[PDB]
Ligand binder design. Structure first.
Ligand SMILES: [Cl-]
Ligand SMILES: [Cl-]
Length: 163
């Protein structure tokens, strides 16, 4: 574990992370996809061998010795708010199990279902709270990666609020 497990947020490409593993915002089919998923495909294409997995699950594939945890959040275009919320919380619980199993001291993680799977809604708080619910009991340093300054500010505030 990390000596003093923390949360941090950085505004930059998760493909350039400084952590011991990465969480992909994957699609269920292991396709290159869009946004975070396409950046992860460019950086770690070998990790997309048999990475297909259902919504609400995570499947880890090694790129060399670097673990890529493919976490499939729900596409809120297709799910009801209620069912989408359940699957989004489930995907993060599976990430916590994988991070634990791998024995890493740090993990780079995007906010699941906040981009092209958001169904056009702002899900920063929903997604981040499900991330905390899953990851709080883990002792890995968690580094959240986002794109926009206003998201960075809100995520930072939410982390600092808990202390
Ligand atoms: Cl960048
Ligand atoms: Cl997304």
């Amino acid at each position: 574990g990390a000596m003093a497990p923390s949360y941090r947020v950085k505004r930059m490409d998760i493909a350039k992370n400084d952590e011991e593993c990465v969480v992909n915002a994957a699609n269920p089919r292991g396709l290159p996809g869009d946004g975070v998923c396409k950046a992860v495909y460019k950086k770690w294409p070998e990790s997309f061998k048999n990475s297909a997995t259902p919504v609400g699950t995570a499947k880890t594939v090694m790129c060399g010795t670097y673990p890529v945890i493919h976490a499939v959040g729900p596409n809120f275009s297709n799910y009801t708010e209620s069912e989408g919320d359940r699957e989004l919380a489930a995907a993060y619980r599976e990430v916590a199990k994988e991070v634990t199993r791998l024995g890493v001291n740090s993990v780079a993680i995007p906010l699941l279902s906040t981009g092209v799977y958001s169904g056009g809604k702002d899900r920063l708080t929903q997604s981040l709270n499900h991330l905390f619910t899953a990851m709080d009991s883990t002792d890995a340093d968690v580094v959240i990666y986002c794109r926009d300054k206003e998201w960075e500010k809100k995520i930072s505030e939410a982390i600092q609020m808990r202390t």
